[PDB]
Design a protein around this ligand. Sequence first.
Ligand code: CLA
Ligand code: CLA
Ligand SMILES: CC(/C=C/C=C(C)/C=C/[C@@]12O[C@]1(C)C[C@@H](O)CC2(C)C)=C\C=C\C=C(C)\C=C\C=C(C)\C=C\[C@@]12O[C@]1(C)C[C@@H](O)CC2(C)C
Ligand code: SF4
Lengths: 206, 742, 73, 213, 41
Amino acid sequence: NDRPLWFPGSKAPEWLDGSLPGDFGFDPLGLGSDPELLKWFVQAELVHCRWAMLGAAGIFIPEALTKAGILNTPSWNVAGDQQYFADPTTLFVIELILFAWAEGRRWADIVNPGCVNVDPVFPNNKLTGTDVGYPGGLWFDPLGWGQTKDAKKLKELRTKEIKNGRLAMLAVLGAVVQANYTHTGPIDNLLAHLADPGHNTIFALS
Amino acid sequence: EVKIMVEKDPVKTSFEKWAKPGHFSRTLAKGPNTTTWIWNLHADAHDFDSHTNDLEEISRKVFSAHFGQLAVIFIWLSGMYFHGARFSNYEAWLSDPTHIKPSAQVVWPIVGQKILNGDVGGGFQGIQITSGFFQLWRASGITSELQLYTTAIGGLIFAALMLFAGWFHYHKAAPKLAWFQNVESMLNHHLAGLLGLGSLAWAGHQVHVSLPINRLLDAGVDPKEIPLPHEFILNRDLLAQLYPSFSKGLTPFFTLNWSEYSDFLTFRGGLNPVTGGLWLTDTAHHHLAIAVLFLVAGHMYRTNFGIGHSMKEILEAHKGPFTGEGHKGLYEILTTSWHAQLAINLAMLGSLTIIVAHHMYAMPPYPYLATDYATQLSLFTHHMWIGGFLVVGAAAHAAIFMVRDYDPTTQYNNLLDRVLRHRDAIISHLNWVCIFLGFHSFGLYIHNDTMSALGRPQDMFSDTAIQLQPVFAQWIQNTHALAPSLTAPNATASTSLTWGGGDLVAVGGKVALLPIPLGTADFLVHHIHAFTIHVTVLILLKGVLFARSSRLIPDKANLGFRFPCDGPGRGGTCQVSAWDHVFLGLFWMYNAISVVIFHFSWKMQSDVWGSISDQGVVTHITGGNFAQSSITINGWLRDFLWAQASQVIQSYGSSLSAYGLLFLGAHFVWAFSLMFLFSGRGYWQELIESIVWAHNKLKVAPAIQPRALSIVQGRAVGVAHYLLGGIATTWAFFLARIISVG
Amino acid sequence: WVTFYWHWKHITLWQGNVAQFNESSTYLMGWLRDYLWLNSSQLINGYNPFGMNSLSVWAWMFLFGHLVWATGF
Amino acid sequence: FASKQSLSYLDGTLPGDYGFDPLGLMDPEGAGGFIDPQWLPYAEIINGRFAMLGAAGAIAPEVLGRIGLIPQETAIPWFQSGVIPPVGNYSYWADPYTLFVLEMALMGFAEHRRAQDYYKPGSMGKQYFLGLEKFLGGSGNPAYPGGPIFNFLGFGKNEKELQELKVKEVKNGRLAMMAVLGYFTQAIFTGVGPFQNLLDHLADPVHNNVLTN
Amino acid sequence: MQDVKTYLSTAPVLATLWFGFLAGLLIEINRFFPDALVLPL
Ligand code: CLA
Ligand code: CLA
Ligand SMILES: CC(/C=C/C=C(C)/C=C/[C@@]12O[C@]1(C)C[C@@H](O)CC2(C)C)=C\C=C\C=C(C)\C=C\C=C(C)\C=C\[C@@]12O[C@]1(C)C[C@@H](O)CC2(C)C
Ligand code: SF4
């Protein structure tokens, strides 16, 4: 019953209880009132923070390696206007074709839990996940981590994950906004800031 | 006695009452059996005094609705300012206000409508606006799009603020009935605080920023080189370069030696000779005087500080021989009934709108306003229509009060009772005078038409034949023409140029104003105006007085304010309620205001406007054909409708095409109104059965049974479509004419 | 409607330019401008502040009609 | 004890209960919103605290620079230093706007905790505050938090001297409020700091009082 | 949240959402396929 909140002194809403990881009682608008929508929004936020982790790692690290005089990949903004073996429309069509399968199987898992776990070609592989959102299995969990004591090693790991994912979402949104406010790379913003944190900030333009 | 009264959190904010569509009234909260539920839901959606019965909840709802309305108005204003900032040729207009047509709206190119973005000038392409916002911003001192952007944001903030208040004072801290009833303090604060301090603040803004900027704009300097409005606040020397009186500091005001402020606090009639508008040095003085007037007038009524009047001892003290027990029992009427207040407020606000529309055209208060004819015509017509609607609303709400708030057990106070007790005389005499006016106004036109048709013009009522010169208006004109010499020694010139005195003023070609003549053609139309106004008063007053009972139906107050008819008996009793009298008076208000705006349009294009050339020769638009051709209905048919309607009809393929389209659209809507105005519910209800049969035959019968519109909703729809069609037709015609030829 | 159609068709046939009806009737402002507004120039001018002519009676009757029509409302 | 009658709420309890309320803004009949008798004393208390903290800093640079102690960076007027750009501003180690957002970020923490202690008295002692979780519980009235930190010396032991200190504080706060209002006003009709105004009044009051402009 | 969905399930709100989506669709089609008088199929 004892747990810290996003706003000390407040009272956690009734639909939030800290059972699910990353819970801090933050839901002012009541967007997660009924459980029918909560069980959907948790998967939404999970897929979101994972995609944001991937995107932030893809944006910030190559930028640093380019500025570190190591790599030479272009800026993250204009990675579309490059030279690949096929048009962006063809790559997008191939992406959608490949993603329809995966996202449909995930959708079927969300709607009817467990209805889709066996390899439809070699019907013996039998993904080992038990909770929707954490599919487990050798493919999505090779190193065995994830099947531990009921709490304090699983719930702890999941909340330590969502905590990183929310930060990643904020970071990538910030990079997106900065790449339009200051027409430089995301690491150039940090460099110019640390060069003069007094006068170099968002207020240094208008 | 007078104190703050609030009930903490009287209504929990939630979405429960939001999911149940009908919730305010229990009669229709159950659900839509038939399809006459969707209609009366929206009908009595705002009937606050009908849902409940206690004045407290009604007052709270009224307060919060006022706050919501204010929020919507703030959103509207912020939108207008943002459009003037982002999609307007304002900065280009400022450099040449006499060759650049205002425009603050652009259209996306999608389906060929791109041609609505006409060539207005300055490198811009957009619809030419007529709101007069450019002149208002030029008079305010606004000289850059930036200064618009900010204020737009400002408006938005207030909007949110208003909304917040609207929620707060209904859900967190709502007052109780005893608080709203303090009318003495309410009037004290609206006189001293809202009007007085508001006028004082605007006079301050004028005298500090609007005077120097506009003076430098009149001296012919670039609107970009003019210092910013704060360089005259933190530099009294930079401001004293124009009005050196500022060099004397704030000392003249405090030593009562303020007759040295004659530089920026002037008293001069006429218009500025270069902008065709009033002197801002005069409007600053006007606002400074109005502010102190309202301030010292805001100390009249008694609060908990011992002194002041009480608006009950004032009323009872007026009780004469002829009028029974005087104004007794009226303070109890205007503090326990929201309708008896809405009636007076609507009547006064409508009359005030008419006064404003009459004053602004005759004394143009904004620079380059009298020059732009389109703006000066739209600002007249719009305000006239608004006032005409508000007065009819006042009549309707007085009728509502009389129907369901009046009671005699306390109204033995023989002022309202006495006027209720000779209605059969009031209405009889009003009917007789209406008949007399109608004859002696329209029969003269019919006489002139028959004579000019019988080849005998010498028997007409023209200005050459038998004359009807209005002598009283001419005497008033001659009296006001000589006022600055005998009856106003300090005013340098007459208040307006419309008086016979004075001369002409030019704004670079087109004329602004000149002395207006008055002949027989004006006598006739003024009597027609009087006649139509009298008929409207007849209808509305008859409804208001007979709202309770009559010889036909002695128990009409039991039936209610809004009901179709009491059977086909007594010969017939259709359209017998007060709502039906308002329905009938809307058409006569429309007639009256249409005649007024036609009068103004033709008279201005004929005897006022034009374009003067060198050596003084001035040729009006139509050519002064109003004094001779406006005495016969045929003249109004060809010389006004047929002639001036020749711009809108052939506007296809031009930037004025939308007016040509809306001409026919409004014609269609007007003619569509007749289907509802002429028919009746029974035929349509019967016809609907033969369609429900075809639906049942294919198993597509809806569960909400399709009943036809009620007998009152048919009338409402008919009058709404009629008014929309008529006003939109006149709108399109007026704009398509004046934009091209003005 | 029928009489409007017939009268405009035959007016344009008798004048000599059938290609005015044949081209200005496919829309609705054409009926209001090329038939009603255009062919009313000698009607309303049946009498004026400059005199009167043979059409004056019609210029009366025309207006007369309107009055009666409006009174029906 | 005069200038109004102690109607039903200014009996004499609160520190500074001079029975002055000619309008009735503490009247408990209509009290909802922000003018309940529990928010007005608190608002007066901390407005007086901030006025006491500001009416000293408004003069401190101007009066210190006359002693020649501070270098000639002390703006003789209290307003030519950043707070109002168009009439003069001093250049610090950062933009006034980033200084403003840093001030707002540092003050949000300082003020939300106090707000939560007002609305929820016992709170702000339960949630683990980062670093050293300090004992900042709501020890009594939300205007007198007590505590071993907000009372370094424990000045005021029992009711008598504590009430005397409280009434002294509220009176000094009212005086400082009037002082900062005077600062604001007479910074407009003169155009110079308040200490210079006092000096020029000491020069000769016959030709240098308010009735000279 | 359930009552919010119920309110969004009302007739005027669904009507305006549907008609706005349809207006957007038709407007985009006409901005990309303008002046269509004869079906080229
Ligand atoms: C200060 C202004 C004001 C206020 C506060 C009220 C307030 C009220 N009036 Mg009222 N009224 C006013 C002005 C005002 N009126 C004016 C100026 C008139 C004269 C026309 C009337 C005539 C009038 C009548 C005849 C009646 C009321 C009634 C009412 C009550 C219920 C109103 C309701 O539910 O409507 C709900 C609102 C609607 C159903 C909206 C209808 C849509 C309108 C008619 C069309 C708007 C056209 C628009 C401008 C453009 C059209 C094109 C676009 C839609 C595409 C309410 C107390 C009724 C009552 O019983 O009172 C107790 C009643 O029967 N009023
Ligand atoms: C053009 C159509 C028209 C006309 C002429 C009238 C005429 C009249 N309406 Mg009216 N009305 C109309 C449309 C019309 N209405 C419509 C559409 C509505 C629906 C909203 C109403 C709603 C309405 C109401 C609600 C009221 C009127 C009233 C009146 C009368 C006002 C009194 C007056 O001025 O007498 C003057 C009359 C005329 C100018 C008519 C022409 C007379 C000519 C010039 C004289 C002819 C000479 C000689 C007699 C001819 C002899 C012929 C013989 C030899 C064969 C008047 C009879 C009011 C009323 O009853 O007041 C008394 C009233 O309360 N009407
Ligand atoms: C998924 C995501 C980022 C994904 C990044 C990707 C795919 C990377 C893409 C790229 O690598 C490619 C493709 C190509 C590279 O060359 C360039 C880029 C383009 C960079 C961000 C989510 C970003 C999502 C963010 C930041 C969301 C923030 C939401 C908040 C704070 C909401 C709060 C509330 O909803 C609650 C919590 C409760 C309510 O009651 C109250 C409110 C307030 C409504
Ligand atoms: S309206 Fe209804 S009630 Fe009045 S007559 Fe016609 S039918 Fe009978």
